[PDB]
């Protein structure tokens, strides 16, 4: 699933509130 994979990358960046 594209969105799930993209999110995994961005969670690692940790640039916006969770």
């Amino acid at each position: 699933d594209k969105k799930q994979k993209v999110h995994a990358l961005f969670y690692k960046l940790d640039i916006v509130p969770i």
Partner: antibody
């Protein structure tokens, strides 16, 4: 009603230093990641750096090589870029931009008006 | 670095939709955005998350991403749509990358 007003451009010699400023208003600044992007006159857009909503994590383009530093003041709604050891190829209009896509990818949804940085002997 | 290949110049003929492509290895695994920059203006976000439009962007602007190709399409082309269009995504360590930009000429 978002606004991003920049200042701090001008002329600087090779090897010199300059600090850019980006004043934000019209949105909760401290909840958003923020970018700098640059554009050499008559050329294309080139990303510079991004900083996290509360300022911990910072990431930079390959050419920065530790010479630039992105920072923010969430109590004054200010974003900064300190540029050191500048080179002729760093001449460009520098924009600040709000992030609005993350975590669903990048999306620079609002851009400041831009200020020109000229590096010249 | 990464990639993002854009044709530097595109022309659209009277009555046709405009089509602007953006290719990169693995691009379909990433989300593409598109920025419009009119002369002397700052860039404006027109597409994000491959296909989505910010509020105030007309629906005649559409975006897609499949395989290695992201595409911006403009129906109901007007002379006011002449601008430079930049696609963007990210490289191998999730750093923002822009395409070279495409200058759109509206013929006729």
């Amino acid at each position: 009603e978002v606004q991003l007003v920049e200042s701090g451009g001008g002329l600087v010699q090779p090897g010199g230093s300059l600090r850019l400023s980006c004043a934000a208003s019209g949105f909760t600044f401290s909840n958003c990641a923020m970018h700098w992007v640059r554009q050499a006159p008559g050329k294309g857009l080139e990303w510079v750096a991004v900083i996290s909503y509360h300022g911990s994590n910072k990431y930079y383009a390959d050419y920065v090589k530790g010479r630039f530093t992105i920072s923010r003041d969430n109590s004054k709604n200010m974003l900064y870029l300190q540029m050191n050891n500048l080179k002729l190829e760093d001449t460009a209009v520098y924009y600040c931009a709000r992030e609005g896509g993350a975590p669903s990818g990048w999306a620079l949804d609002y851009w400041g008006q831009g200020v020109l940085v000229t590096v010249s002997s | 670095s990464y990639e993002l290949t854009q044709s530097p110049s595109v022309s659209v003929s009277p009555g046709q939709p405009a089509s602007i492509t953006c290719s990169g290895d693995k691009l379909g695994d990433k989300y593409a955005c598109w920025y419009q920059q009119k002369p002397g203006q700052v860039p404006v976000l027109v597409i994000y998350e491959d296909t989505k439009r910010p509020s105030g962007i007309p629906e005649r602007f559409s975006g897609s991403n499949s395989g290695n190709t992201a595409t911006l399409t403009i129906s109901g082309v007007e002379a006011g749509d002449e601008a430079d269009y930049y696609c963007q995504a990210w490289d191998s360590i999730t750093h923002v990358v822009f395409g070279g930009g495409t200058r759109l000429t509206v013929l006729g």
